[PDB]
Write a protein that binds this ligand. Structure first.
Ligand SMILES: *[C@@H]1O[C@H](CO)[C@@H](O)[C@H](O)[C@H]1NC(C)=O
Lengths: 195, 228, 229
């Protein structure tokens, strides 16, 4: 009787940026989704494919968890068939997504008096991102026709922009923690059932 | 019932072209993607190339760049690898591995083929010691350093002679099914340690450590363990 | 303006006793605090970050608690190697402020610093911080100095790209900080030295990837002594 270590990922002290989201693999344990579904502490709980109404009696081969931090206005962009800065340049989901996402407000931890500038996002890219693709490059973007030559100047901008978080900001400009769960199903023994 | 087989092996003179084929079964091949790994006789492992789930992003190694081409055909559950201008240092055993679904090209696990023999007639990981000897019931400790921070993105392999590598420890000391509790590990950041308890005669093999933090996959030097 | 008051100033105990230390703040700092210990003749070592997050190498015998304004630190069993000086600092507003310190009595990455020396008052000096084994441009670097008989004091910091500069109130207009990404080195150019500028200067770094703000200090250097007379 091994319990799935969900405490290490949901109750983690430090989270990752949206452009560098962390991925964790969970296997060979027993998971109780009823406790998570009855926490009354998550602002948003909406997902497609599987019904959250007590469907923990299913066996899956593996479970993958993705974590990142965004603001309130960009929470809607984390959904299949969505467009925006995040959906195109930072995190893209397939149209046939099979999983669930959990988001809650964390203004009491991630905010900082005077401004917290350690959270960044990508604003310039040559083309849209494919689903489940991670880009961590820091190459100087060429906006016009004059090559940047590795230096910043006219029509040469850094591809990353830093979030500005303050405790006095509005609800639409407050940090939010997002957790994404994915279920894999193959011709495998599928030891992850969680009765 | 996931199986992988190799085809197309042979002997060719330098300056010609050869093509290999790998067939997959037991899963949806259409939206996962595969890897290519080779191992020279008497040397370590080396990552070659990877393809996406829709044949839109292809990546190669520095030593095979410009001469190797990877192709996909989502109609027969087969994979193609085109080799041009083969040289003397291309004599190695080639394995086709299973990757991560969609555009996750940094996923790789316990899914290896039997391998084929072809003969022609960044982050740096250091592993120490290069060799080790012990008695029947000694304790074995292996260290695998890293060139930078890779977080918890390290796993360990075991390879018996004449056989494909076997995964024992994955994702920073998480045990895998069908593995005894004797094997264990610890570490995070840039320092990792692999530990073996009360040794047994059937533990004589070579162990490797490899990282999957970024696209260029790199392996460890290796350590041979024999009973004294 | 955000100075932290630390009590008690000193405490004496035997082996097996329990010692508690309180660190207050002028205003709420949420969960931005750290604890350090410094043995005589050695650089400070981090023990607890955030509020109660134990370090991997520190034994589970050290515990911390508190949030907002009141913070406490407790040692379960006192041993012969637990006698040192402890400090508390905040990392949410600039400039960063350290604690007074508490005295307890018996009852991969490499950093090299050079450039210290004796100079006439009113002169100038330049210090260099050398870093290797990691990505220099992915972290923010800070300069910290300690008086020969006083506590720590935060001097200045530099951003990971070089576009942001932070200076203390007692060094503005006379000090300058810069970095060279190509050579993987950090610079500290200072002018108009006074007799009150004699201290051992340290080079600090954070374990986590921080690009704009230094926050905590996980790695410390060896230090250079500068004497003005
Ligand atoms: C996280 O911690 C809180 C309080 O410590 C607890 O109520 C919650 O169940 C924890 N999360 C998980 C997934 O156990």
């Amino acid at each position: 009787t091994n319990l799935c270590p969900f405490g290490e990922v949901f109750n983690a002290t430090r989270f990752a940026s949206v452009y560098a989201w962390n991925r964790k693999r969970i296997s060979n344990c027993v998971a109780d989704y009823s406790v998570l579904y009855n926490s009354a502490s998550f602002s948003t709980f909406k997902c497609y494919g599987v019904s959250p109404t007590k469907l923990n009696d299913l066996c899956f081969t593996n479970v993958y968890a993705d974590s990142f931090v965004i603001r309130g206005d960009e929470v809607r962009q984390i959904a299949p068939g969505q467009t925006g800065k995040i959906a195109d340049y930072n995190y893209k989901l397939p149209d046939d997504f099979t999983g669930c996402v959990i988001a809650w407000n964390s203004n009491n931890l991630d905010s900082k008096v005077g401004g917290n500038y350690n959270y960044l996002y990508r604003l310039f890219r040559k083309s849209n991102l494919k689903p489940f693709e991670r880009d961590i490059s820091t190459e100087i973007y060429q906006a016009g026709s004059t090559p940047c030559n590795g230096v910043e100047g006219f029509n040469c901008y850094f591809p990353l922009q830093s979030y500005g978080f303050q405790p006095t900001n509005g609800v639409g400009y407050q940090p939010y923690r997002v957790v994404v769960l994915s279920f894999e199903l193959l011709h495998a023994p599928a030891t992850v059932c969680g009765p | 019932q996931v199986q992988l087989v190799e085809s197309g092996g042979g002997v060719v003179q330098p300056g010609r072209s050869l093509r290999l084929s790998c067939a997959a079964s037991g899963f949806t091949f259409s939206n996962y993607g595969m890897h290519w790994v080779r191992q020279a006789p008497g040397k370590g492992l080396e990552w070659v190339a990877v393809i996406s789930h829709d044949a839109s992003n292809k990546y190669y190694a520095d030593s095979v760049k410009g001469r190797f081409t990877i192709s996909r055909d989502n109609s027969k559950n087969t994979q193609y690898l085109q080799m041009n201008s083969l040289r003397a240092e291309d004599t190695a055993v080639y394995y086709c591995a299973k990757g991560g679904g969609y555009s996750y090209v940094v996923d790789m696990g316990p899914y290896w083929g039997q391998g084929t023999l072809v003969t022609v007639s960044d982050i740096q990981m250091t592993q120490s010691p290069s060799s080790l000897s012990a008695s029947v019931g000694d304790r074995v400790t292996i260290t695998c350093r890293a060139s930078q921070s890779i977080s918890n993105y390290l796993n360990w392999y075991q390879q018996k002679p004449g056989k494909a590598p076997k995964l024992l420890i994955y994702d920073a000391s998480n045990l895998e099914t069908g593995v005894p509790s004797r094997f264990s590990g610890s570490g995070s950041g840039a320092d990792f340690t692999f530990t073996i308890g009360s040794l047994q005669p059937e533990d004589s093999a070579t162990y490797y450590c490899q990282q999957y933090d970024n696209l260029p996959l790199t392996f460890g030097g290796g350590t041979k363990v024999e009973i004294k």
